[PDB]
Amino acid sequence: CPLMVKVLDAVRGSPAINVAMHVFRKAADDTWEPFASGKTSESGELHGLTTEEEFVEGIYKVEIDTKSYWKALGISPFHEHAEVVFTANDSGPRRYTIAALLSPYSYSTTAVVTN
Amino acid sequence: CPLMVKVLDAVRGSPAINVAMHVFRKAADDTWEPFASGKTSESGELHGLTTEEEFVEGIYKVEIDTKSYWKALGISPFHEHAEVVFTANDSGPRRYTIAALLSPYSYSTTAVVTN
Amino acid sequence: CPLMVKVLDAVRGSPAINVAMHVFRKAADDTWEPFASGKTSESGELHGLTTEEEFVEGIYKVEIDTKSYWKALGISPFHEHAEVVFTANDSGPRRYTIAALLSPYSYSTTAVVTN
């Protein structure tokens, strides 16, 4: 699949399991249209969000529901979610891995783009 | 001055100067209302966005125009913009410092909340 | 293998390939004894550094040769290397993945510890 997300928990030193995420794609009217969603597995990875055919060029937003993740663990974090907004496939099809590293008051995201 | 934003450049090891950003507050209808904006100084900091009486509890979004920063340096980056979305909370400390560390394909944000 | 290292390049949005690293283990005399070494593959990963039998309890240092990596790409970075120093296996055998994210003037390391 051309879009995968992996999430780590910097407090536990573990993959962040059951992190919900919603992907949106900017529509012609400049609105965010729902594109795909899912939750991380026990490996902290979310595979199978989309297909090469459906993952056309556009501007995508991956909302990672970090507040819902920390609150499900009984922790009150700072951010509502982590957002990753990027243009995809504008030079032809690519594979995107979006990594995220979570702490209650800090996070880091990184993209690995392969052809 | 209850809200400050500081932006650093991880490629050059410098403050990120002249970085534009807009702050929004979430309205009752779930839309983002413009709240404040500015661009970072020679120290990479943006002061004076708001005041204590105006900065009431609620959900805020800081949208940092990282793509324009990198393009002005002749570098093509991954993200359209860096986003920091959070709830302001009176039960906690009263000063919010949002820091963002920028790289072309990665960005980490941290919140430092002090009294 | 119970110790793996993965390295990403935040400038290119790519696995950091051919990053050399040297692992040391603290000896009884408080010196750092050479334990294992290798370089990242095209996936940015270094597998096979050690075995369950040889990876005994102790204090280990993973030196990641980030300067040698950036200089081989014609970039002058800030750090000499990235160091990761940790006690391993003190509660019994574990598997350790050490992740590192590199920029010329900044890096981040993260440990995933599994049983």
Place this chain on the structure above:
Amino acid sequence: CPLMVKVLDAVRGSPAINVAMHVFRKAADDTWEPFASGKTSESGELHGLTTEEEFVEGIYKVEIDTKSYWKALGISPFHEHAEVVFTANDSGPRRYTIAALLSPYSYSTTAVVTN
């Protein structure tokens, strides 16, 4: 004041206060000679480590005692200490700010070099 160190706590969203650190300078025999030390203030900063005339070009190591910080909070961390190893260079800017962001199983350091 050519060298300052700032330490932040990513779990609590605060300066990391009372964090001890030692700075070493690499000697001609490749050993680490003690150079300066101190502990972070209520702002998470350590000022006054050295002076311009003493801080000559060479390789320096800042060893930050992160393990003691986390244990004082009742948290068991991964790393023995955070290490920042770098060459001071006169050709570049003259002020060095080393920042470290701490989480139990992860830590990111950045250098901000300004004039």
